[PDB]
């Protein structure tokens, strides 16, 4: 009964078997902006069904020796689908997003993942250089991997310097091989700006962390895939101008 | 109407609590389906399991206040956000400049860095001496030069003369000088941490200095000068202390794990990564 | 019983105490609500 | 003018003073408030949350595997697994959590507090545990018939993954000042013990050597008190 | 005498502070008020009032002719007449206007503004020009079939030789300060870009060439906040 | 041509959603903006230098130029002021003579 | 609810802030109203 | 500000005098009192 | 500068040491010659006396 | 990643073994004719 569960949102539709209840980040719902909070004059446009819904981005192969990944929301979907059409004619934006994240293996297979939505999320340069100056500065495209999601180099500090063990302040839920197939999360709208631009800006982070290492015997099937599942949520945009995707 | 489908809360609720909670006498407990002790850790939801459900209490009525924990008590305390050298008679100079931010180091930056969003008053406190720790009677001046306005190009400068920007004239024997300040932030809340870049355009991959600054949290300059039409010949330092009031802190984040190597970035040494623990011998000794 | 000496708000005291929790919003930030003496799943 | 007498404590900068200065900025109002969700208020409810907490240190696990701590199909019977200290603020596991961190910022703590433990194992393993909690006046247990003499727990891997053992509060004083060592050993909180109840059995072909998580955190009955400053981190000049 | 303490900020000047003095002047009234027309109460009056704006700047046009801009017939079509970004607080058209003058002396702002043209042409002359806001995000539009995805005005030229581009408040932030470049960028306002919608004709025995003169102003969400001192005036030595 | 401005609003031109705006106003009114003090005049006094021993001030608030600049956009000012003297040796060091 | 130290009432503080305008003098100076959705001439 | 004349007496430390001093700890409530047997308040029972 | 080091915290270990930033410890700066410096202290015992 | 701009669900292998995807009627028309081919492509539903 709390085991299987399904979702739906715009076209698309999920169902899990073995799925672990659903994670409300601090509790509260998506919303559209109240006419208080709003500052911008224009009117929003709410498109709902074509830009809300389900958006399913490729697939991660985790292996014994995997580090984890990473991902950065108004990034991935900005140049997929009509979400990220919308996003690079628009100059402000709004939005929560309903988050899942999936993992087959069988009985015989053993580890955990660690899913969690970090809002915020700034990656660090990695070196010991003290003069700002000289001091390494952790790319484009590390910081805003897109679609393709980035790796962790040392997924003990996070990239942020920062003990992964207080990961669990942050909502987050656990995939256990043994326990629940996939994990869920829905986030309401962060900031502290009731619109924000969609390129330049990335609100929150995922990190999909193997803390338990992933294990198994010979003969069982190796090619154990990662793939999740984003559903831009009760979405909003205004400044309607020509597409600036950078 | 004519058509159909245009025709179209949250979870809990906060509790005023005055005091720790208290204990209630239980008993045992034996009968089956009834297990406060399983949990499930996937589903993200900490352990609601209680002291009176485990194991047989007493009765217990707790009079230890929770006060001294809140984030406004929190906060209250004042900490160094930043030391200024003033030297008026080495060569030119004649003033000196400090930009804004309450990063320049540890203690307090750590205690901030907590939280992603904090919305806050401001008091900020002067010590100003001598190198050597000695006061002596001269007069000073500290300037507030709000973003956009012109720094000081020297001791005799026009800029000084302080129409709008607001100043604060004080002798160097006298007590500290205080001021409190309000949110000046064009945004809603100040944020320590902004993922993303202040401005479009293309973004290198070797120098991305650009990366993780938010304009919002820039709100200027403060300069220093000492007020006499020929230059004295002393050195000064100024330490700079700030209490931190009307406190909201909103989305907690872990502290800092690692040394920090910058001021404005969270760069830290990959090969020295600390650990943070006390390394043991083997398990199951305990000291 | 605070006092202020200036109009501006903001330069006042540490003002009024207040005790506040809701942890369980963080504690539990649940869609389905777990009842404390049963079984999760 | 109206006749006063100043007394000892002036013209002192007192830190944690509470007092009014005088504003800068005449008649300003600032930017207008939003919602913003996660407003916390105490770090009471920072505290209540179960974070990742180290057991295995060592020199040995790198990273990231000094998270977890093995267990294994044994050929002795009742034999130990692991164990550690349940000081909070003591140098150890507990500086891992993000309870120990934020009671280093306080000398004095009072309140249960509960481990929880979460078995990564494959759904095909099986075994039970037994987690004991012993108040002080020795060290450690050598055998477990000694440990069972504590407040314990005898658990099952089974679904529903997690445990949670509570250790209650349990102490002469009303609080435990979070320095240890030297003479402070007269505060320390107790030993918190993980045997084997029976041992961890695997069918053929399935991994037979799997790890348990552990977990920290603190009830409602757990406060502070006199905020002092943190000693975990450190400068070693201006930082540019 | 009462007890007193003295606190930090003791014997300091602020000059924002708002305190009173002794009266040099025992029994003094002064004298007495009369009615004078004009008197202003808040500078925000002060800014709805529309100036003069400059556009035409380079290094040519000597004083007068900076504050217009020329409309002409155009052999190929779809060109661009003038263009300008809508910063008040920065260098550039607004130096001109006594809104951007008074928001100089300030912060932030946060607002709608509004910018009129008036042609200046011949009573004969017939054309319609296609002024565009653009919220920020590019630099100016190359061709008006990009300039046209944003806010904008196709405006005829005939009686009430005037319009009103109104440009909407459109930011992220409640505010954006007056200082730009650098990394504030991210406050630039946008850009505003003044189109030939059709071209510009003329009957025979007529002057082709002719003048729009371009405005600006605030509205009444408009605001200010953050006092400071303007950077426009300088001073090297007393003035005798 | 008629020396009124434009009446034209937001509300008319495009369409907008409802904004109810709390930002203040006050920061702004003639009263707080000339609130804030300034350098009006600055004497220099030598009592050794010759026979000397006084030093005379005619009060005008041009002198120079930042407070003066406010000032001169207004016509017509009624108001009362307050008077702060900072007084210190040509090195900035203060000594205890009585002026 | 400020206060004066002295009998000279202007010795006092900035006394009571005021909200007034009337920009319509300096916007709108003209003898026949305009209506703001109506052609001017 | 509020007119004000000093008085002497200022500036002295009366090692008996009774008066305030700033608190160090802001919103600090301690350790609940429990019952002991024995309390004392005036030296005089302790003379009989 | 008087700084009080409640059990636990770490101890100046110099002049210039960052331990003197007091975040969180109290502390109080006084001039040498003004008034003597007084403060209230609470009842800090971990006990009931 | 093109597949999933159009309508789909997401299915889990378990106990209740079975899924149903339903195609929703999407045509521009009231009627498809069941007649493909040439110029009856017109027609088509689409690919699954
Ligand atoms: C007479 C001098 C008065 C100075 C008043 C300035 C008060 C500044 C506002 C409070 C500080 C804002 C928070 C600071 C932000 C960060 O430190 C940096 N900007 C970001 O790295
Ligand atoms: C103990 C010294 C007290 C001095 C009191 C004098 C106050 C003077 C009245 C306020 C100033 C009036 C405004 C000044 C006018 C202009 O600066 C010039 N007279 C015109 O160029």
């Known amino acids: 009964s709390d085991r299987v569960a399904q979702l739906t949102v715009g076209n698309s539709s999920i169902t899990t078997q073995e799925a672990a209840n659903i994670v409300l980040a601090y509790g509260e719902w998506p919303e559209y902006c109240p006419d208080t909070d709003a500052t911008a004059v224009d009117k929003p446009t709410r498109p709902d069904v074509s830009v809300n819904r389900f958006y399913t981005l490729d697939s991660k192969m985790w292996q014994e020796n995997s580090t984890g990944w990473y991902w950065k929301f108004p990034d991935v979907l900005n140049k997929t689908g009509v979400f990220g059409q919308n996003a690079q004619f628009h100059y402000l934006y709004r939005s929560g997003f309903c988050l899942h994240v999936q993992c087959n293996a069988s009985k015989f297979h053993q580890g955990a993942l660690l899913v969690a939505v970090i809002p915020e999320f700034v990656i660090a340069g990695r070196g010991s250089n003290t003069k700002p100056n000289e001091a390494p500065h952790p790319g484009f495209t590390t910081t805003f991997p897109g679609t393709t999601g980035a790796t962790f180099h040392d997924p003990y500090v996070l990239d942020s310097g920062v003990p992964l063990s207080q990961a669990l302040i942050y909502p987050h839920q656990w995939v256990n091989l043994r326990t629940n197939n996939c994990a869920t999360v829905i986030v309401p709208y962060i900031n502290a700006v009731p619109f924000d631009s969609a390129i330049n800006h990335s609100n929150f982070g995922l990190v999909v962390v193997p803390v338990s290492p992933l294990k198994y015997s010979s003969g069982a099937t190796t090619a154990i895939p990662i793939t999740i599942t984003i559903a831009p949520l009760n979405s909003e945009f205004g400044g309607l101008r020509q597409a600036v995707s950078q | 109407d004519p058509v159909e489908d245009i025709i179209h809360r949250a979870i809990s609720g906060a509790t005023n609590v005055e005091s720790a909670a208290d204990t209630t006498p239980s008993s045992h407990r034996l009968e089956t389906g009834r297990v406060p002790a399983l949990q499930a850790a996937e589903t993200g939801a900490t352990s609601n399991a209680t002291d009176e459900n485990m194991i047989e209490t007493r009765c217990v009525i707790n009079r230890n206040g929770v006060l001294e924990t809140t984030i406004n008590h929190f906060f209250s305390r004042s900490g160094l956000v930043g030391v200024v050298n003033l030297t008026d008679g080495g060569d030119t100079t004649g003033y000196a400049t400090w930009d804004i931010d309450i990063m320049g180091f540890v203690q307090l930056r750590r205690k901030c860095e907590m939280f992603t969003y904090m919305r806050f008053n401001a008091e900020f406190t002067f010590v100003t001496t001598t190198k050597s720790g000695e006061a002596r009677p001269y007069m000073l001046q500290y300037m507030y030069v709000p973003p956009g306005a012109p720094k000081p190009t020297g001791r005799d400068a026009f800029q000084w003369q302080t129409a709008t920007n607001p100043s604060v004239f004080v002798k160097l024997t006298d007590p500290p000088a205080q001021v409190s300040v309000p949110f000046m932030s064009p945004a809603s809340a100040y944020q320590w941490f902004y993922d993303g870049y202040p401005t479009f355009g293309q973004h290198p991959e070797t120098s991305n200095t650009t990366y993780g600054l938010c304009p919002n949290n820039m709100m200027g300059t403060f300069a220093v000068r000492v007020v006499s039409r020929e230059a004295s010949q002393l050195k000064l330092q100024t330490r700079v202390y700030m209490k931190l009031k009307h406190v909201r802190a909103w989305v907690p984040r872990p502290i800092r794990s690692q040394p920090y190597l910058l001021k404005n970035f969270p760069n830290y040494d990959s090969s020295k990564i600390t650990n943070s623990a006390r390394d043991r011998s083997s398990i199951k000794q305990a000291n | 019983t605070n006092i202020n000496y200036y109009k501006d708000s903001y330069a006042a005291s540490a003002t009024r105490q207040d005790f506040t929790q809701d942890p369980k919003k963080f504690t539990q930030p649940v869609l389905d609500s777990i009842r404390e003496l049963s079984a999760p799943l | ?240």
């Open chain 4, 1 to 240: 003018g109206i006749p006063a007498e100043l007394r000892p404590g002036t013209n002192q900068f007192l830190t944690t003073d509470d007092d009014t200065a005088a504003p800068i900025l005449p008649g300003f109002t600032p930017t207008p408030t939003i919602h913003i969700p996660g407003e916390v208020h105490s770090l009471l409810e920072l505290c209540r949350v179960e974070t990742i907490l180290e057991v295995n240190n060592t020199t040995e696990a790198t990273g990231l595997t000094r998270l977890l701590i093995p267990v294994s199909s044994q050929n002795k019977a009742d034999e130990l697994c692991a164990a550690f200290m349940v000081d909070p603020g003591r140098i150890g596991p507990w500086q891992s959590t993000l309870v120990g961190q934020i009671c280093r910022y306080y000398t004095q703590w009072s309140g249960s507090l509960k481990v929880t433990f979460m078995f990564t194992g494959s759904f095909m393993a099986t075994g039970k545990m037994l987690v004991a909690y012993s108040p002080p006046g020795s060290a450690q247990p050598a055998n477990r018939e000694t440990a069972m003499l504590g407040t314990h727990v005898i658990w099952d891997f089974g679904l529903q993954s997690s445990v949670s053992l509570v250790i209650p509060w349990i102490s002469n004083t009303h609080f435990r000042t979070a320095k240890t060592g030297g003479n402070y050993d007269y505060y320390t909180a107790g030993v918190v013990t993980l045997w084997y109840q029976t041992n961890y059995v695997v069918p053929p072909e399935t991994p037979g050597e799997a790890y348990i998580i552990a977990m920290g955190a603190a009830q409602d009955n757990f406060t502070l008190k006199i905020c002092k400053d943190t000693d975990e981190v450190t400068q070693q000049a201006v930082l540019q």
